[PDB]
């Protein structure tokens, strides 16, 4: 018989981003967001201007789309709305009527696509809009123009 004791551990790292890399999220606004470094940094500079609340319900978004429960898929489905989709809300994206609209009527049997249009809307005006104008911000040219060479 001896006694013992367990503890915890330390985590661990690994590469970032490459200049190859950086470029990458001027061609599509995706491959940023799905960039933990270029996401990270892309959020920051939309809190500065405001304009966070695009990125957020782009986050939800997904952290929707893997919902597998019957009452959340639906349930939530109205949160992400009452918060975004909702009138004068909070974080109201930039959707006009037309898309907005749209979420609305998928939200009777809303399952997985339900804000598939509404995701593509705001995802098109954060690569248009703030994706272009992240770039000029330092932010980016510190990803590209860093302490390593173009």
């Not at 959340?72 to 709305?81: G, N, T």
């Not at 272009?132 to 040219?141: A, C, N």
Request: aromatic share 10%; glycine share 4%.
């Amino acid at each position: 018989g001896s006694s013992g004791s367990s503890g915890p551990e330390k985590p661990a790292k690994t590469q970032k981003t490459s200049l190859d890399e950086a470029l990458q999220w001027r061609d599509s606004l995706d491959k940023l967001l799905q960039n933990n470094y270029g996401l990270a940094s892309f959020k920051s500079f939309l809190k500065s201007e405001f304009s966070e609340e695009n990125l957020e319900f782009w986050i939800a978004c997904e952290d929707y789309k893997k919902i597998k429960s019957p009452a959340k898929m639906a349930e939530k489905a109205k949160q992400i709305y009452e918060e975004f989709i909702q009138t004068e809300a909070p974080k109201e994206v930039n959707i006009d009527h037309f898309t907005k609209d749209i979420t609305m009527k998928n939200l009777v049997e809303p399952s997985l696509s339900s804000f598939d249009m509404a995701q593509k809307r705001i995802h098109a005006l954060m690569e248009k809009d703030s994706l272009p104008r992240f770039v000029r911000s330092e932010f980016y040219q510190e990803l590209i123009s860093g302490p390593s060479s173009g």
